[PDB]
Amino acid sequence: PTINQLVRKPRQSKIKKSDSPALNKGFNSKKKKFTDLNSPQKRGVCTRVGTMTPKKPNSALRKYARVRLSNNIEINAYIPGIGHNLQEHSVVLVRGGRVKDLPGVRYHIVRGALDTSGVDGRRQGRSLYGTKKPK
Amino acid sequence: AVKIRLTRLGSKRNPFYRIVVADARSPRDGRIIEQIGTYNPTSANAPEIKVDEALALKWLNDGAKPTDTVHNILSKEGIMKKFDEQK
Amino acid sequence: ARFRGSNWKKSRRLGISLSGTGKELEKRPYAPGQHGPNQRKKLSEYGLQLREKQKLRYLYGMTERQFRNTFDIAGKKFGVHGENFMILLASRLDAVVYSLGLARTRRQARQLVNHGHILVDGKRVDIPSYSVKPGQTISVREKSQKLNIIVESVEINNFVPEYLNFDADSLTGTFVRLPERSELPAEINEQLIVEYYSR
Amino acid sequence: NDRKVYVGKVVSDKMDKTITVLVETYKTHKLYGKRVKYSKKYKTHDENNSAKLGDIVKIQETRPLSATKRFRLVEIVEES
RNA sequence: AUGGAGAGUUUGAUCCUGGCUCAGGAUGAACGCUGGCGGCGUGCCUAAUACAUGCAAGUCGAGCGAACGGACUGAUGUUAGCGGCGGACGGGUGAGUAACACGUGGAUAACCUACCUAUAAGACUGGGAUAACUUCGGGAAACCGGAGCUAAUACCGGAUAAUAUUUUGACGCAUGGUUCAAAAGUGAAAGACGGCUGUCACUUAUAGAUGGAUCCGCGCUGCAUUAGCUAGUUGGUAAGGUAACGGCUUACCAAGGCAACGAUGCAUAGCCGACCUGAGAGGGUGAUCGGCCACACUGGAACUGAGACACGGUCCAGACUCCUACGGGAGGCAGCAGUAGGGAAUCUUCCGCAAUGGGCGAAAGCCUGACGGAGCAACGCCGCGUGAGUGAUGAAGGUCUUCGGAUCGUAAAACUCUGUUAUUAGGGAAGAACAUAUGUGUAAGUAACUGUGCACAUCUUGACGGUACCUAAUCAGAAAGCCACGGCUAACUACGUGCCAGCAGCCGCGGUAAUACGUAGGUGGCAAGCGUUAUCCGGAAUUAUUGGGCGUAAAGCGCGCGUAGGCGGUUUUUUAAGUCUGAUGUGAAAGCCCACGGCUCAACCGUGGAGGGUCAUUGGAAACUGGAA
Secondary structure, X not given: OOOOHHXXXXXXXXXXOOOOHHHOEEEOOOOOOEEEOOOOEEEEEEOOOOOEOOOOOOOOOEOEEEEEEOOOOEEEEEOOOOOOOOXXXXXXXXXXXXXXXXXXXXXXXXXOOOOOOOOOOOOOOOOOOOOOXXX | OOEEXXXXXXXXXXXXXXXXXXXXXXXXXXXXXXXXXXXXXXXXOOOOOEEOOOOHHHHHOOOOEEOOOOOOOOOOOOHHHHHHHOO | OOOOOOHHHHHHHOOOOOXXXXXXXXXXXXXXXXXXXXXXXXXXXXXXHHHHHHHHHHHOOOOOOHHHHHHHHHOOOOOOHHHHHHHHXXXXXXXXXXXXXXXXXXXXXXXXXXXXXXXXXXXOOOOOOOEOOOOOOOOOOOOOOOOHHHHHHHHXXXXXXXXXXXXXXXXXXXXXXXXXXXXOOOOOOOHXXXXXXXX | OOOOEXXXXXXXXXXXXXXXXXXXXXXXXXXXXXXXXXXXXEEEEOXXXXXXXXXXXXXXXXXXXXOOOOEEEEEEEXXX
């Protein structure tokens, strides 16, 4: 562009879509419209608990759950680790981060924190998974 | 009115003071009109006063009045005496 | 101490003595552990640039952040940058209580300064990283001059550098003049550190 | 103390006692450093209305004097 | 000079283009697992949601009366009241606000200011009332209604009095100015002293200091799939009234003003010093601290005052909450603690006015949820530790094995040594400097004195806090975990499982011989922390001013005529807007940076510089760009 062209119309940059977009919203219950927060975790309550099958080459039966959050948006969230204990109407803390195989799953359920428990016999990165130190 | 007073600096348990021409309505630590001096009640032998002695006489001559321990300070300088004198 | 681990295994892995020399790397002069005795492969750029941070820092017992928080004071001065780093660490206080011979090892000349025996300039100082400077006076406390490990350490020392004096009776140093690179630990390529911290 | 003055050019005359000047100025442009030219119409006040449309004149500033006028005519300088 | 690194991932292989991902620094963070100590900080970012309970503003009997109450006439009170002053400060919060809000440079011959300080002139003479009090009544509170009284530095009538308003004469536009000489009007206080005067109340005139108000220049969010906006609107003319200019109004008139340099609309937002990131250019942000602004259940308003249209004032309208003998009464934490709700998420219903500051009072004193401390929380920074020395890199154990061995490993026993801390057992700082009183001088004023101001040296007292801190004694005891180990990117093996269970930032791994899954040895990185997630900047030259392109990878409009706008041959003279060089005034402090001092070091604190502007004013130069001839 010549310098007159960049003075009439100037250069504009591009915008950042997030990942994780349902963590950037909160709900004002009384005025009754959404609000913006940028929180790192949100609390939810689970409305299903099942398993999906992965994609292109992979293969397994992968445990996941549908959970509606504090603002009232609903999402699927992968349950990590090996065992679990979720039912209907459990209270989970959810966190960012997508699982690549599953289409359309893009949150993770923090193990350790609310109703969810740590994993049952883990010893080596035990603070993901949160389990406590044996003996 | 317009006063001549001390602000407080330093950190906890360890104060330093600047000697200030403010206004009486102001908060201790905010808006001022001039700075005049310095004072350090805690250092070793006696406190270190230090105070420009010809701005302070400008302001005693205009009104300001000193608070009660800036009257023990402009005293050791005999500033409160050359002010007395020019009758 | 802070590290207070095991100094022969760190001496075999990096390749310098780190002590009274030689003795560490004798029978087994290779790295430690199960794949120990079997051929070393090659180290990368990062591989090698990091072996020099870690050489100069396990010598002087510092940790990171204290090591790195010093690295750029050193690089505030005028001069060449990566030799004031070498100098300013020579001038630490447990590092001067070692170059004088007041103790026989570096982990012990820090429990002197720490436990409160040393008294630079007449006043007790117990901060291993105090940063003494040209003209000060390292001495010894007075109820602590017939500690065994002090008289035993001072005889056999045999050496004192040239920016230090040492009045071997009285137990009393000086720290005369700053050092210069010709005298500081010598298996240490100092631009393998300045280029590590510009990554 | 003294009160700022300008030089101008009259771009209207329809009001009564009241002419509108255009003063021309210039700003560089903080990012690509070329200058630009712009303008801004100062409403000024003349009494026994003299100056005419299109006409380099000169104006000084004063106390507020109607809703929008704040300057007054000083001296014509030339016309056609 | 002090400053600038990349790597993986499209092919059978290659060179490009182009996305994607990682490695760095940040944060009022949260979350998971672990946690020894000290110092400096920080800590509801969400519903400006609702608030239970205690406190955040009082003070003066040297203005005054009291049925006052009472030492002893009643000291002292002020239980109560009238009067005076402060309550507009300080404390909180950003809902609203795209605005002269804010920042920066100017003007106001268009302005206001209690007190403080000076300099003069004064304070004259009278009056009428009234609180409290008392006595009758009512009213569920809340309170009210009569009388009968009584003070005040309360209120008022005149006396006199400027530069007060008028009418005369002797520049920056509407002028300003001071010399008049007439006229109209306009003041006041006593209190507590000493022998008439000192103190501190009043009143008027001027100034100064201080705190405001107004106007302008310039900067300062996006959105045309938002192109027309206004009607006191835009000028004029009078009249009001404002502290002050003005459509600021009200009439009477005219038909204007504004806008693609973006009128209007719409969405969003306090602003700034500053902060974070980047070699920089730039980008992101406006916690804690200061300056400004706005707001106090919500919307209207006025009183009192120098100053408010008023967080702990008033009245009205609305919604809420409580009480009641149903007629009516009361309220309002975006003060400080604290409660409920909501959220991933955020502290004691804490002590003292000791210091520093304010309010009132002659002072003593009093009031202060300002402030000073102390509690809570690894929430951050910074320092010290959890030993050190020698000692077989062999015991016996784990793990591997090529079964010989190898490794953990100087690691451990083992002997010594020390006390940071830890414990007990004794001492024990500064932060303070007074005010006030008491003397003694001195100076002014005095008939003289009291007093006043100054100078001195005396007397007092620290919440924290017996908190630092010191000195002994005692003992290595009581103080490390968390994440890796395929490649990027330091650190590998064994076994279990067998596209299962799982893992995954990206590439991808797992289908009975995975350094990728789990666990166990060994390694490596960091450390009272270490991982994970959210967000910002860099890498990214991936908006390119630095510093990019359009034949074929994304990209020259099918082509003309042309309007703004941008840009333009040669020479001379002049001008000086841009340009260059000075001098000043400013761009607060705190920052940032540099120097230095004080902290045992360091964080931290304190001083002096330096830097920082499309800045203003005033001089000079004249090549270039511009203006003229």
